[PDB]
Structure 1
């Protein structure tokens, strides 16, 4: 019912590492979207709440996820943002879908273990 921050981090960190391990698929996701650098100035006309792997990793490393579902919700925020902004035929959309497939495989045994 109640989780300790370090045990939560140890349970969840391998699922995040499995996303970082996807290369090149995780590359658009390893740092916050920079619309200036990427040439996509409408990004924040479309995406309300940005999220990326580096932000999730810091929240995990500083104990900000006190329930497993808060971690999962940030991962899916990252996915949903990319599916929302990018065309279904685009690199980032396809890479996002690959990451979601990987995550779905990795997170299920972990959540079964945690609750």
Structure 2
């Protein structure tokens, strides 16, 4: 099966918007990690490939996903980085877990519709 970029954008954008609309839980994830500004300069000793909502938005808007699972992989990358770098007791970790629950509710029916 072939997916045109505008079909992916149409189908997937509501699931990305649902993540943005979690307030305050999306706030750690709305911008690319800047380790010096955030006071976490060792970040890229732990995480290699950063991901955030603004980068996913741009990739969706510019046709950078061939297949819907490439979009899922980037959201999962964003979550994995946060669950790796931050302690289980931390705000960022807990906010990530909230977003992950919302993401399932959004993406699971879409992925099944898209086949």
The alignment's TM-score, normalised by the length of structure 2, stands at: 0.99
Deviation at 1:4, TM superposition (A): 1.1
Unpaired runs of 5+ residues, structure 1, are none
Deviations 1:68-114 (A, max 9, x none): 00000000000000000000000000000000000011001100100
- In the aligned structure 1, how far is the partner of 2:41 from the partner of 2:64? 30
Deviation at 1:15, TM superposition (A): 0.3
Partner of 1:99: 99
Deviation at 1:7, TM superposition (A): 1.1
- In the aligned structure 1, how far is the partner of 2:8 from the partner of 2:52? 19
The alignment's TM-score, normalised by the length of structure 1, stands at: 0.99
Structure 1 moving runs of 4+ over 3 Å? none
Unpaired runs of 5+ residues, structure 2, are none
- In the aligned structure 1, how far is the partner of 2:72 from the partner of 2:30? 17
- In the aligned structure 2, how far is the partner of 1:52 from the partner of 1:36? 17
Which structure shows the higher helix fraction?
1
Tell me the C-alpha RMSD between the 2 structures.
0.5
Deviation at 1:23, TM superposition (A): 0.6
- In the aligned structure 2, how far is the partner of 1:114 from the partner of 1:40? 39
Aligned length: 115
